Subunit: 276 residues, 6 copies
């Protein structure tokens, strides 16, 4: 297999850095009203054009997320503002590669947060691979009519109405060989209820681990590890980071973080090329 | 048994409110430089004058904690400054009750943070009851010569030099009946590596749960639960709070939080009287 | 507390006895085309009129289950036909007791099968108590647009649209004291993904265990245990039956089965009276 | 290693199809007396003539199983009748290959049901590899003098009298490398108390998974999975099937089912040749 | 209920003290050939004459254990010699109380060692309660034709021939209420594969814990704990001792050790009376 | 990589054989005062001179262990006397190889017993790899001021004073790839609280497993396994031995025992050469 891997730029988000790095700048006796920072970071997705079929990792934000008629609650829009030109919409990024949503065989959902599962509803011809615990959690949000938070009611509503085809990764399930040199990593609970990663073995580029929000940035990764300001399973989060570090060492793989602005700038984007 | 329970005021501490309540005031697009605050809370201990023997819950901060010649690292002093008059020192609070350290049969260490284990070194004639995971973690800090953090090297140094007598509560150990109507609750991992609580049944007052840092404040308790800005085991923390809520319901017990300023002000202090 | 407990007759169902008792009559060399039986059994619910608030255990079938315009798939209607006069509808049974749906404080859903969770949508003023694993499973059925089976898409649709208030019993959660002498038993996985039971302690009647489909009938119960023809967690099912037997012995409680025609006939129904 | 693999025909069995496929033909309102059928399936064993030593997988039924003087209880004979010519007896099948029981180094007992462990007593010069949970269960049947069921008292009696040499596979034991390209798969609880499979890697044929009763037939395998009418551990059974499906995918292995009539007919029998 | 509890003297055993207390007298540079000692200890059983039925705890050694025609292997006889007069045989001890074997409702087998399970074969009218792991272990000894060790082949042979009625305590099974004030304690693995204890609440005497070999002697009990020279599950053993210590404290119960010569001297034997 | 592996002779120890092999010579009716023996065995360490960095496995005893001014308690010196010439001190063994302590990158502590962790304090430039459970246990010994036993207070004191850099292997952590063909095996609890082994793949010599005290001698190894006279976790110990047996078979590796005098005689020592 001689696949091509694309990094697609799906815009920028901003939020309190305390979300990204817990207690990054604590108040002190001489600085008791310490102020935080409003940091900008990239939202991106990865397409693997594989001979066995096209694989998509994450789906960024829904084009109708922001605005007064948006899907995101006002509170969400104010705390996690997403900025994207039409060019940045996943549909458009794929189109520019002559890829239609119906051409996607597998979508790997790292998790079901607003900035990763926004465009799942588009892929009605794919098998959507998601952690069963993440799926369960999101559905509870939906059933409980939770309108605020990182799980977008309107997005979930759309997944159901569009009759997506789901394959859940069970809590105690081994990693999944999706195709030659493409492995779905079952990270389990940490950042969210259930995290999935990807290990890609490219002929000329070698090993790549897509960590998503298992590791926000190089600052998160360290060492030492700097966990995010809010977290589902702290123990699971720390275990997952260490696990990724081990896999990276043993397989001589690069680790691609969820939202590292510096790393993202160095990526070859879909407007410039790909990784073979 | 007709026991007397005393609440002893061991001064005040201040810190970033984000420590207490995670992401209490997140930055927004309109408030991108959102400032935190430096909140003040009480440090206190509880003495149970029981016919079977005096039981002490927590030990506050060491009198030699703060200052240029202090045991606390300068960074620790600036992030978590402790203010206390001489009358606030545990040794002094006990003396006013005509109680000598040598008189204490049991000391229950909720955990070994600087604001709870400060004066353990005093009680050389007692059995020190602590969670085995907490003890292990603290000892690792010592062995690794960790100077910064919530575990004070000089304090641990003194515990060893004073040849304290330890009984560790095992990770999977049942609750311990210390005395008639006094039970050590094995909360396990959460806020710290290993948390212990206390349930006291007084003839007149009824049930009291000493939660310590298992629950910082009423705001923490909710519902809904508002967890602290940092946390060892998030899942364990949440489980522990809900467990306490259940025990309180089933036993019709009051819940005494670790550091609730408003609750503390309503307590009858050792200088005014006791509970029976 | 001097509560009154009512048994409400919510009609009759029929199905292959092999569903109820696995391999009840296996084919043999001399009877190779052994035929099954189509057995009839009661659907019922229990109301506990408690001074602390009214508690409802199970909700039977939705009045619009059967028929060409019914909610149940044709296949379901043919395999599990429900027969009920208007008098048998839960709404009507409650009305005859001068109880309105909005008067119900707690609904305990043993599980979310079609014959137990049919009328959940009515109780918009209650807290609905359900096993988290059962809730998760049902929601997946909904999200996956599963139209056939024991989980009714239309029913689930209604729960969400009616904005029911859910309290999920966690997989490893202790039993819940709902009110004086009313305990929700966390049976876990067996018959379905997550089973809840009830133990009621009545002043004059004594102990009652509501087992629901944890135990179909006296034939199921034995001894020896005769498990149902289809089952989620066989090991969990067997463990649960034995657990109920132990609780029954230790608390001298009656066991009320899910669908025992003989036992049901002996019950004092809501048209005759109640249990104090 | 250039091993030869032989498939040995050990006759036919019949039973209620409901045993094979649970609720295969449920009663309906239009067919309330739905009849089952008495399906016929093969009993077979596999001999691996390996340079490191001959390995036998399963041992079929004891030649003294059926008849008025038979080891099988009359009830067992009528529910699971076994038909076999003399040429079908394992001892005879081996003799035709010029293989004596004393020549067998290893016998892998998938489990200890009457149709798999029938002739263990023959192999007194071999190490008998069996799951420890299966061995324990079988021995309990013996000790409890259980005359009915799938565990034949007289067979077990003979194992003990013939002083067979056992190696039990522990519940949490890794797969066992028996010989070059021969691995015992520890499937654990499911169909029975403890299931063992085999993965064979042949130079010419490639990968073969002997699943035995972990998967009865292609119908069982699906997807979707159609489980048997009775089952020890339903969760374990489902997990095992999916595990086998994964192993088959990852190793590009064929899956040989326990009792698939159509698959068996396509096999090259020991009377025609072997696999290499 | 007003039961009578009898202690029955079933003779004396001797063995290397190192069996009783591990490394009781280690070799030193000044004593490199350190000598052990051959200590004597009692074998005893407990009959609870309960209004609900007679309960027997342990059964001592089989009368045909010792001698050239004895069931015990020569090595066993030389390492663990049992000395008992005819009066000491359990059958005779019972007969002198006007109790026939057929009169026993329940036999609780602490474990199946030669000195506890010797006379099980007598009680063909009782339910024999044993830990499932202990039962499995013993049966494997039998099936493997182990004619040496602490599990007597001939004894096990007799259990099966005499068609004893077994009720196994499952590994993760709760304590069993056998009768008013009589509870079987599920100790689990430790001394052996599966240990059972008994807690008896007598109206006049109060609480008694029958520890059997969970605790050999007061020396074993300490504290500190001094474990035996050979042990199946060291961690389980230690946990069990501490569990017994807790139960004893919480229930104000006496602990009756397995083989404490000094304690056994102080008991009232069946020749002088009983405990009420 | 072309590493050189050195076996360094760090003297001889003697102790009661009962420590090495539990109940090796039990008392009998004809030998009631059976004598033990005082057996001698080697203390040794392994240096892997790897291109990626020098790796040291174990560190033998501290040079100031024995004598009236020694670190070892008198009781310890008499029970476990260590005899070593100056040439046998690790520091000198290393010096003769032109290796300074500061030259060591990694020290793998199999465990922290007196005969393995004696010279840890020398390697202030290395990362010290130890099992977290072993580390915790030793530190508790120190904090509890245990001045007897297999954990040397003065040794631990020195580790902390010398500011060693620790990397703890977590209880549920995978094996660690330390360098090309060098893997730390996480054996877990058994002989001690937490055992670490090493697997080395040498280009010329092939596979070597350093078992340390996971397996004392070939007699320990069997089969059958003959466990030591004292043991932390008997089940863990047995599991570990069998695990090592499996690894050895699957990787065609030699197993180097902790203290096998006969095996150690056959090794090439650092005075004669090395293994490539
Ligand atoms: C009840 C609503 C509370 C509002 C805050 C809760 C949001 C959950 C915290 C979180 O994970 C924020 C988030 O989803 N951030 C994105 C941005 C980077 O990757 C993320 O996870
Ligand atoms: C780089 C280490 C030093 C930075 C401090 C991080 C340790 C924070 C641990 C924590 O939970 C803070 C703390 O101990 N707070 C006190 C105040 C209230 O009760 C507490 O635990
Ligand atoms: C894909 C649809 C398959 C149709 C059969 C599946 C139904 C699940 C089996 C079952 O539990 C039937 C059921 O729900 N029966 C009711 C009647 C008595 O209590 C019950 O659980
Ligand atoms: C009352 C006990 C006797 C009734 C028989 C019940 C045992 C059924 C166990 C089973 O799974 C049937 C069985 O062994 N079938 C064979 C045929 C195919 O492979 C098998 O396991
Ligand atoms: C090293 C050869 C010994 C032969 C194997 C016999 C196993 C002995 C282990 C044991 O526990 C002996 C035993 O059962 N002793 C009785 C006597 C006191 O209570 C006992 O457990
Ligand atoms: C019964 C009094 C003994 C004093 C306590 C010392 C503990 C001895 C336990 C042990 O394992 C001794 C030890 O560490 N021996 C060394 C020598 C061989 O490898 C070892 O483990
Ligand atoms: Co996220
Ligand atoms: Co704290
Ligand atoms: Co149901
Ligand atoms: Co079978
Ligand atoms: Co014993
Ligand atoms: Co050691
Ligand atoms: Fe994100
Ligand atoms: Fe605190
Ligand atoms: Fe039902
Ligand atoms: Fe079969
Ligand atoms: Fe004994
Ligand atoms: Fe050693």
């Amino acid at each position: 297999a001689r696949p091509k891997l694309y990094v697609m730029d799906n815009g920028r988000m901003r939020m309190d850095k305390n979300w990204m790095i817990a207690m990054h700048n604590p108040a002190t006796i001489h600085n008791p009203n310490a102020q935080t920072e409003f940091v900008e970071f990239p939202i991106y997705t990865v397409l693997i054009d594989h001979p066995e079929g096209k694989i998509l990792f994450d789906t960024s934000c829904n084009p109708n997320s922001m605005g007064p008629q948006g899907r995101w609650a006002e509170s969400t829009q104010q705390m996690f503002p997403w900025t994207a030109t039409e060019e940045c919409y996943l549909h458009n990024r794929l189109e520019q590669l002559k890829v239609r949503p119906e051409d996607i065989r597998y979508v790997v959902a790292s998790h079901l947060h607003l900035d990763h599962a926004g465009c799942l509803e588009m892929f009605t011809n794919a098998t959507i691979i998601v952690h069963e615990d993440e799926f369960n959690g999101a559905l509870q949000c939906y059933a409980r009519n939770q309108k605020e938070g990182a799980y977008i009611w309107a997005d979930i509503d759309a997944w159901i109405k569009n009759n997506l085809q789901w394959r859940t990764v069970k809590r105690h399930e081994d990693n999944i060989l999706l195709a030659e040199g493409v492995k779905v990593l079952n990270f389990g609970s940490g950042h969210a209820w259930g995290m999935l990663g990807l290990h890609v073995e490219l002929p000329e580029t070698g090993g790549i681990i897509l960590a998503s929000d298992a590791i926000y940035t190089a600052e998160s990764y360290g060492p030492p590890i700097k966990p995010p300001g809010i977290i589902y399973d702290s123990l699971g989060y720390m275990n997952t980071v260490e696990r990724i570090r081990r896999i990276a060492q043993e397989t001589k793989s690069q680790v691609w973080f969820g939202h590292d602005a510096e790393q993202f700038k160095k990526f070859r984007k879909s407007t410039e090329g790909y990784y073979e």
